[PDB]
Design a binder for these strands. Structure first.
Ligand code: NA
Ligand code: NA
Length: 327
DNA sequence: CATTAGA
DNA sequence: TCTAATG
């Protein structure tokens, strides 16, 4: 956690670099399990050889561990860090829509800058266009104060369209968070569940409304169950317009709301921990259900959930307010 | 680890 | 169809 920090951090740098600038999923996977194991290791790695004993660590990495242990750096790292091409890819990649694959390509063609990207908006698809368009806004955190106004809006319309709709803003925001990266609304309806052959308009009706009143202002991707746009707070009485925020909305079979809802509220750790718990308690939990475990090794049989509570009760735990779902 | 664009 | 990118 801090005993092996540099080593891991270096290893991760290396990893990430393989995967992105180069297409070396292997090396790239190497550096990762290595970085994974050395992390767990309960003592101070004092040399390569020591590390070397570790599963996942071989001659390659050890040698890096030495250089790094020896002199506070690493050449490859010093080289990579400096390297234009490499830096370029790491950056383009910042744009919503541009992955590594495309980042490599662009660069190859000579697009390395945001400006480059402009002059060639043409080479970019829709997504990427928006991403480039709101690059600044997209990189900004969402102040909870604002989250509150947005939630205020989304809920109201959802309702207006159909009062039968159940919407919940999930994420860190749900967990008390001072700021957030983007708004994630979870949604379901009664007439929509596990079996009931869909109802696409269900997602659509609402999306339509949001755009209708100008809350949603762009569409990165809209399908029958997941919508992925951009929204914005009505820039009040001039002088202060609001930044463009990422927003996602997902339809859910009512019969699998809360599990999902649980899930997305996080945190990543409370989850795991919640999940690990259910196991002892004779269960299993996943993004959609909670099935009683059977002794034969495994089992199925989706238990009936009406609220976050039921899930808890099942595993016989203490209802934990989102606020404290931090771990 | 699943859903969507795209080509 | 696959392969990318987000989450
Ligand atoms: Na080894
Ligand atoms: Na990106």
């Amino acid at each position: 956690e801090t005993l092996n920090g540099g080593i891991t951090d270096m290893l991760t740098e290396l990893a990430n670099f393989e995967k992105n600038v180069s297409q070396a999923i292997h090396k790239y996977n190497a550096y990762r399990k290595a970085a994974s194991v050395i992390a767990k290791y309960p003592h101070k790695i004092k040399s390569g050889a020591e590390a070397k004993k570790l599963p996942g660590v071989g001659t390659k990495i050890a040698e890096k561990i030495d250089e790094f242990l020896a002199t506070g750096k690493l050449r490859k790292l010093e080289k990579i860090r400096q390297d234009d091409t490499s830096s370029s890819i790491n950056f383009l990649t910042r744009v919503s829509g541009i992955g590594p694959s495309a980042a490599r390509k662009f660069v190859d063609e000579g697009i390395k800058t945001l400006e480059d990207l402009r002059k060639n908006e043409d080479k970019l698809n829709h997504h990427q266009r928006i991403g480039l368009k709101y690059f600044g806004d997209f990189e900004k955190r969402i102040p909870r104060e604002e989250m509150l106004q947005m939630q205020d809006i989304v809920l109201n319309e959802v309702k207006k369209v159909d009062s039968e709709y159940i919407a919940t803003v999930c994420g860190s925001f749900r967990r008390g968070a001072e700021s957030s990266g983007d708004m994630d609304v979870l949604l379901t309806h009664p007439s929509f569940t596990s079996e009931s052959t869909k109802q696409p308009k269900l997602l659509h009706q609402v999306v339509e409304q949001l755009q209708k009143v100008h809350f949603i202002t762009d569409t990165l991707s809209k399908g029958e169950t997941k919508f992925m746009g951009v929204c914005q707070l009505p820039s009040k009485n001039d002088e202060k317009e609001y930044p463009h925020r990422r927003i996602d909305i997902r339809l859910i079979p009512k019969d699998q709301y809360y599990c999902g809802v649980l899930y997305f509220t996080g945190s990543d750790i409370f989850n795991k921990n919640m999940r690990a718990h259910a196991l002892e308690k004779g269960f299993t939990i996943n993004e959609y259900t909670i099935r009683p475990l059977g002794v034969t090794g495994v089992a199925g049989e989706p238990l009936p959930v009406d609220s976050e509570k039921d899930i808890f009760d099942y595993i016989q735990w203490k209802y934990r307010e989102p606020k404290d779902r931090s771990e």
